[PDB]
Amino acid sequence: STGSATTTPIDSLDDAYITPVQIGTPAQTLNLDFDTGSSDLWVFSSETTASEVDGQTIYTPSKSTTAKLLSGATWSISYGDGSSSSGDVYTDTVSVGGLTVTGQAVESAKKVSSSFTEDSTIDGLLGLAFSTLNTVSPTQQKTFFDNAKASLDSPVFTADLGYHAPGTYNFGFIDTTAYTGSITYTAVSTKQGFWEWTSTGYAVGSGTFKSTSIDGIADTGTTLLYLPATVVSAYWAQVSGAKSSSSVGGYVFPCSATLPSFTFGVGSARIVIPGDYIDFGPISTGSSSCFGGIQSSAGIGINIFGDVALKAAFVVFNGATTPTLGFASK
């Protein structure tokens, strides 16, 4: 089997991407944030504290003839941005782009933190990291991809995120029309539960490529590109007037600037992020200070190849017995 679904930016800045997902019988379609950095499929629901729902579409398990309470199971997750959610668990039928998994754990939110409530466009998350990170207790549950894998034509999914435009998540096949050149594959460590890999270096604009190993994670659920402070300083030093602002929480730059590109290495191959992809717009409405799309990881503990980086590539998440990642230009 295969599946193919369009993923759409939630706003004009590509702050996140939503993909429609069918849950239950009859189908209830919710727009979920596909997140290769976590491993829970959780949704706003009829059980979510009413004051914490503000415009999201909810899953109502009582209206699904295939929903079954997973007795005794609870979940609770905290994300790197400080947001969180928790609740109980149903199993139900879940379909993405024509690919159907029966008995998928659907984690029903009883509580969500403010950033989730405040984002009316995101009805939940669909985790695509390794199932060892799944938070369901006392019986850990498998991700949608893990459950589908054996049925897929090939044990892979691909992320093709658009810049200010829709893109595609495919399951079970590699669309050879969706990229240019060849796909370069690179080793993955699953030791932390992430799609963790080592970039071979970087360049800023037309500058020379610096060969240096940068371990990080391919994370569709993180908006920006978080890299070591040395790398980030070298990038922003090429932008007149750019500075790190403690009050704003990162590098800002004059909105009048034209940003340089940023290149990252994948083995001997190179992925070029155009400068425009690094502009996240005014820090507040009407400001001439703009927020940068490349930020320091120094306070995180891990480097994160988020959407800013991934949207410049066609990315293969190869879930073979030994997982690997593939990157192609497009």
Please give the C-alpha separations between residue 82 and each of 79, 181, 272, in angstroms, as whole numbers: 5, 39, 30
Per-residue three-class SS string for the chain: CCEEEEEEECCCCCCCEEEEEEECCCCEEEEEEEECCCCCEEECECCCCHHHCCCCCCECHHHCCCCEEEEEEEEEEECCCCCEEEEEEEEEEEEECCEEEEEEEEEEEEEECHHHHCCCCCCEEEECCCHHHCCCECCCCCCHHHHHHHHCCCCEEEEECCCCCCEEEEECCCCCCCCCCCCEEEECECCCCCCEEEEEEEEECCCCCEEEEEEEEECCCCCCEEECHHHHHHHHCCCCCCEEECCCCEEEEECCCCCCCEEEEECCEEEEECHHHHEEEECCCCCCEEEECEEECCCCCCEEECHHHHCCCEEEEECCCCCEEEEECC
- With beta carbons less than 8 A apart as the criterion, state whether 47 and 7 touch: no
Whether residue 255 is found in the same domain as residue 165 = no
Supply the CATH number for residue 200's domain.
Answer: 2.40.70.10
Q: Are 170 and 183 part of one and the same domain?
A: no
Domain boundary (174, 200, 231) is at 174
Statement to judge: residues 35 and 153 lie in one domain? yes
Q: Which of 154, 101, 178 is nearest to 319 (CA)?
A: 154
Q: Do both 165 and 261 map to the same domain?
A: no
Q: Which of the residues are catalytic?
A: 35, 199
Question: Do 287 and 210 share a domain, yes or no?
Answer: yes
**Cited resolution, angstroms:** 1.1
Same domain, 97 and 121: yes
- For residue 273, the enclosing domain spans 175-330
**In a shared domain, residues 152 and 253:** no
Does residue 213 share a domain with residue 162?
no
Domain shared by 15 and 131, yes or no = yes
The residue from 107, 142, 174 where one domain ends is 174
Starting from the edge strand earliest in sequence, which strands make up the sheet with 210-218, in order?
Answer: 269-273, 262-266, 196-204, 210-218, 303-305, 225-227, 294-296
Number of compact structural domains in the chain = 2
Shared-domain flag, residues 270 and 152: no
Which among 174, 190, 224 is the end of a domain? 174
With CA atoms as reference, report the closest residue to 56 among 109, 11, 94, 13.
Answer: 109
Does residue 53 come out as left (phi exceeding 0), alpha (psi in the -120 to 50 range) or beta? Answer: beta
Residues 119 and 238 in one domain: no
Mark whether 191 and 115 lie in a shared domain. Answer: no
Copy the structure tokens of residue 219. 């994370």
Asked if 194 and 171 touch (Cβ cutoff 8 Å), the reply is no
